[PDB]
Design a protein around this ligand. Structure first.
Ligand SMILES: Nc1ncnc2c1ncn2[C@@H]1O[C@H](CSCC[C@H](N)C(=O)O)[C@@H](O)[C@H]1O
Ligand SMILES: Cc1cn([C@H]2C[C@H](O)[C@@H](COP(=O)(O)OP(=O)(O)O)O2)c(=O)[nH]c1=O
Ligand SMILES: [Zn+2]
Length: 405
């Protein structure tokens, strides 16, 4: 079997999503039809309750020079991060000469606000293309993975960080123990390590299995994060639920006993226990619901084809690779996917090879239906696409259930 990456306990599988391609590899249509594949399956550790994948994709296959995800492509997320950065400037970064390190800064969506406040900072961004976009904004970026050794190097040259922050990144990192030792080396004795990532609670409640793909190794909960912190010398001292990305929790870790946990921590712990969130039977029931969504979504897509209705997709999310490859959905059922990311445009989606076209191409004459892969961006997207729905075009969603509206 698989050893738990947090505690070395045994991992029990509950969901097997089969062979999957790299989720963010978009091929030109002339490229050879070969792709790396791996088995995507999810289990839960016996000892610490951490839900995690059973096969790791090597980091350098996922994060490198042409990694295509551009965080700044969403107006809602640009606002969400600017606000988080102001909240840190008002609270944890008030000292003389404060220092904030962000793990996974991407194109600088968060750090831009810190730089504009004149505060010392450093972004770690091992994907050099998006790192260069952050540096264009005047952000200080290191094109390296955060891990024990690179944290030590930053401590040596830059001194302690008052805040270490990671969004939608820590759950990507199976070497979380090395990151934690990095945090231990680098964080001020009275600092915080704050991270926010897709929440197990939301994934189980919404059956949002597309949150499981190569780059999302862990599905954190308050229960497993508390365990992970404790084992590494930290303590879970705050939690905040966030609506972004289909539902997240922002976890705040401090050195143990240095701050008193908020009431929020015990409250969420108790709700997770009450709701049996991480019980193997709950997680197996989620896995049964995942198969039901597969079966209903393919039946719908096939019925639409039989009735001569046109179907496209909207948003070439990484998540969508799980949906198209587990469900067997290709360009015979969903003809194109529309997306705002130039480096995904005029390419094929991974595994399923549906052509991706610029969102500006989604215009009159509209298709009958758009399968909404960027369902976590529904409000922002539908506000930009009122004319489609006014014209009679309808959305197909598969979270939390297959439905059309
Ligand atoms: N060990 C590590 N250290 C720092 N960044 C990492 C990393 N492993 C992956 N990454 C970066 O983590 C990012 C995850 S995507 C999330 C980016 C942004 N924080 C947002 O929330 O939108 C990618 O840009 C990826 O290259
Ligand atoms: C917000 C928004 C996103 N998109 C595209 C951009 C990204 O390629 C994709 C959203 O991806 P996202 O859900 O942020 O991430 P992931 O890759 O983790 O699933 O949707 C649009 O085309 N239009 C929009 O208005
Ligand atoms: Zn464990």
């Amino acid at each position: 079997p698989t050893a738990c990456r947090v505690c070395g306990g045994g991992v029990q599988e509950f969901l097997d999503l089969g062979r999957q391609p790299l989720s963010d590899r978009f091929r030109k249509p002339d490229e050879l039809d070969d792709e790396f594949t791996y088995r995507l399956a999810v289990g839960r550790c016996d000892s610490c309750e951490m839900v995690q994948l059973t096969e790791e994709v090597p980091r350098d296959l996922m994060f490198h020079e042409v990694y295509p995800y551009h965080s700044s492509g969403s107006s809602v997320m640009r606002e969400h991060f600017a606000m988080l950065a102001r909240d840190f400037l008002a609270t944890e970064l008030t000292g003389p000469d404060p220092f904030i390190v962000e793990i996974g800064c991407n194109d600088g969506i968060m750090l831009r606000t810190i730089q504009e406040a004149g505060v010392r900072h450093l972004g770690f961004e091992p994907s050099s293309g998006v790192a260069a976009k952050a540096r264009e904004k005047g952000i200080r970026v290191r094109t390296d993975f955060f891990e024990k050794a690179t944290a030590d190097d930053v401590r040596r040259t830059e001194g302690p960080a008052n805040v270490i922050y990671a969004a939608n990144t820590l759950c990507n990192i199976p070497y979380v123990q090395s990151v934690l030792e990095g945090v231990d080396a680098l964080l001020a004795p009275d600092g915080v390590f704050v991270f926010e990532d897709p929440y197990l609670g939301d994934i189980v409640a919404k059956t949002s299995f597309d949150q499981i793909y190569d780059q999302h190794f862990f599905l954190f909960s308050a229960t497993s994060v508390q365990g992970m912190a404790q084992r590494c010398g930290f303590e879970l001292v705050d939690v905040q639920r966030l609506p972004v990305h289909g539902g997240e929790v922002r976890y705040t870790l401090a050195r143990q006993g240095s701050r008193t946990p908020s009431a929020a921590v015990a409250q969420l712990l108790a709700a997770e226990r009450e709701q049996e969130l991480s019980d193997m039977a709950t997680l197996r029931a989620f896995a049964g619901n995942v198969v039901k969504i597969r079966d209903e979504l393919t039946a719908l897509l096939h019925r639409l084809r039989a009735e001569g209705r046109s179907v496209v997709g909207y948003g070439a999310t990484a998540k969508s690779a799980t949906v198209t490859n587990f469900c067997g959905i290709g360009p015979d059922l969903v003809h194109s996917v529309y997306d705002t990311t130039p480096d995904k445009q005029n390419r094929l989606t991974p595994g399923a090879h549906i052509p991706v076209r610029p969102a500006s191409a989604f215009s009159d004459p509209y298709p009958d239906y758009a399968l909404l892969f960027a369902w976590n961006h529904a409000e922002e997207i539908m506000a930009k696409e009122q004319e489609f729905h006014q014209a009679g075009g309808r959305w197909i969603l598969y979270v939390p259930e297959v439905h059309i509206r």
